[PDB]
Design a protein around this ligand. Structure first.
Ligand SMILES: C=CCCn1cc(-c2cccc(C(=O)N(C)C)c2)c2cc[nH]c2c1=O
Length: 102
């Protein structure tokens, strides 16, 4: 485990605490979200992010933050603003970037 992997595991733990229902835990399936795979071209979720950390795919914090933002942006594209899923994505995007900067 490299120093970067250790830091990213720390950030990921802190980010996942902000999703207590686990809506972001695993890839979204079309059964749960009809037509999702044809609307969202670059899916992302915390489980995929964990696998990417362990596989050593993130070479910088910047690359990691971009996947986090992608995950939130996908949720704000697929879901309407008045939904639980949109609201959490907006909340966690802003809080997560703040947490990773302080
Ligand atoms: C906020 C997260 C962004 C990703 N995400 C996830 C789900 C989702 C996945 C698995 C289980 C459930 C769930 O617990 N229920 C009750 C359906 C919900 C979902 C459903 C409609 N839109 C989305 C959506 O965008």
């Amino acid at each position: 485990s490299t120093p970067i992997q250790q830091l990213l595991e720390h950030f990921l733990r802190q980010l996942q605490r902000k999703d207590p229902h686990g809506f972001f835990a695993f890839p979204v399936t079309d059964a749960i979200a009809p037509g999702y795979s044809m609307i969202i071209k670059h899916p992302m979720d915390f489980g995929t992010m964990k696998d990417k950390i362990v596989a050593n795919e993130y070479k910088s914090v910047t690359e990691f933050k971009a996947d986090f933002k992608l995950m939130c942006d996908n949720a704000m594209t697929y879901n309407r603003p008045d939904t639980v899923y949109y609201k959490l994505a907006k909340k966690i995007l802003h809080a997560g970037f703040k947490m990773m900067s302080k």
